[PDB]
DNA sequence: GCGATCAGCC
DNA sequence: TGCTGATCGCA
């Protein structure tokens, strides 16, 4: 059963064939400054195990690595590419990506590993990497010889399914999508993961003593309000004191007990002082423990910048998501914790902060999908879209449109996005059912071509068995024809948001591309730190502003051509804060 | 370790 | 709608 391969002591000529499939093993999750702890190779000559003492300080290794006319064949090739730049080497030629063919073939399987990719396949030659190193407090790197096998069996599906996946996707008509989209877009990805974002630990240490002085605070007086102490993060303590104790009464249950959700605490504060302060010290608690703490943590301190990693390969619609930490969920919304931004800043004296976002990327996507008339007329007059539903569904002229109407409106247009639901509505707009119903219905007389698009492509889930983006990207929806009302709606929604989501998201991945090469042909030392869902932060010499700001706008609306303009806004500033 | 609870943004 | 991660409780 043994598969066969050479221990090699040194590399040779033969192991530096123009095609192979190419293992670079980094076993921790966090790849950035990590061990490389094998390497292994296939081609056309055999198979090969290496050590990474040896192969990484062999010129002609390293050479090979970087020589982009060398083809390699790989899983997960960003996290090779990274742990190699942390090491001055580069990366060079990788022409296909297993990790991400399988991603684009069904986000829904979850892969993570080469076996779960290969499984699709039917290809069982190779084990699980949980199986191997173990999980959690037990997760170590087995002997040499348990480890090379591993690595060369991967190398060897790597090898051997190439061709089978990239088949599949030339029949999804994905190929372009992998090959001109995603790929390329891992390639940035590991730079700007490299690259981190500076951070002022100054400012965030003197943010957390506020915090904490204000903590202390809150946290005494709700004692006081409740006549002792308690642990008020435990909702099982809480729900004692608030719907016993004080007797407030109970508006919502949970599986396990009371709720104490922000939304029933507010229902509930007209009833006792304590309930104000509860929410207060659920703000307070947030910004400490989740962003001052949980910054301050994995920030280096050697360098000072945070460098977190983007999973290109998790979402169910095609978005990225940010890991140690998320920097796509930083706050804004409320003043206290968008002060948290200052402390993002420049990694170099005299550059800036320059951030630029889609306005509204998702409902002109639908607009153009739908093509709807009066969606589309509307942003072509970039009309307040917000107000301009309001008039719609209201039936009144836009000075009659008063701040609760466009509220609603407005609540109206995100779960049209989301798949609209009479429920989700009235549960937002805390309404009945048959209310959010109303609203509902008064939307599509408006907007006809939108009803038209959401039966449609609930049909077309249900025919297809799946739904598509504007790049081709697929979502399989199973669900779709399930007799039970829950798991048949949830299926529904999808069907409704994804060609949404997972058009916007296809846009910004092209934009990004466009941008960076535009960036190296104006020879910009401007260059990409984050993105976060619709839209793009860099940092460059204060010197360069100006040129951003025609060129990212630029680049960014003209990404793909929609039936409605795209639209883009830009700010720029001294920190991620006052890029406002 | 792992669920159920909560809350941050899109 | 799509996410990550915190603290608690239990195991
Ligand atoms: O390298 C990122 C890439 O690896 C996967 C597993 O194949 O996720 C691992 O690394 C992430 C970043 O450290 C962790 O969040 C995740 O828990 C770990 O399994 C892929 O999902 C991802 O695309
Ligand atoms: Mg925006």
Redesign the pocket.
Known sequence: AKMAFTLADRVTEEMLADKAALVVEVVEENYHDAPIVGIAVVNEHGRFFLRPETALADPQFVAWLGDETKKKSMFDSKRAAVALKWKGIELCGVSFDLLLAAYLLD?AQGVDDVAAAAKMKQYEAVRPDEAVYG????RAVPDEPVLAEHLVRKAAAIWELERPFLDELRRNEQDRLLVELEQPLSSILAEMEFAGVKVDTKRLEQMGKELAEQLGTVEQRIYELAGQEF?????????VILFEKLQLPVL??????????????EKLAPYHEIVEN??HY??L???????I??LL??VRPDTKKVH?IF?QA????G?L??????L???????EE??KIRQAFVPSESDWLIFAA?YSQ??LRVLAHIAEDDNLMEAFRRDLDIHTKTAMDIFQVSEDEVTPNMRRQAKAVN?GI???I?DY?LAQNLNISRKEAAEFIERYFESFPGVKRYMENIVQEAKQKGYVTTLLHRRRYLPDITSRNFNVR??AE??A???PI?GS?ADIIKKAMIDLNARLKEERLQAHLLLQ????LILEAPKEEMERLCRLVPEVMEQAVTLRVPLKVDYHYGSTWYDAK
């Open positions: 986000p999980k959690g407090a037990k642990n008020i993060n435990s909702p099982k303590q809480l729900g919502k249950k949970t599986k396990t007990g009371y709720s104490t959700s922000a939304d029933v605490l509860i929410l659920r703000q608690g947030k910004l400490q423990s989740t962003y703490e949980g943590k994995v977190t999973n998790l979402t169910q619609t978005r998501s940010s890991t140690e930490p998320n796509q969920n930083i706050p804004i919304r409320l914790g968008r976002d990327i998702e995100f996005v989301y798949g639901s989700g709606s949830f929604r999808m409704m948001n994804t989501q916007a976060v869902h619709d839209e």
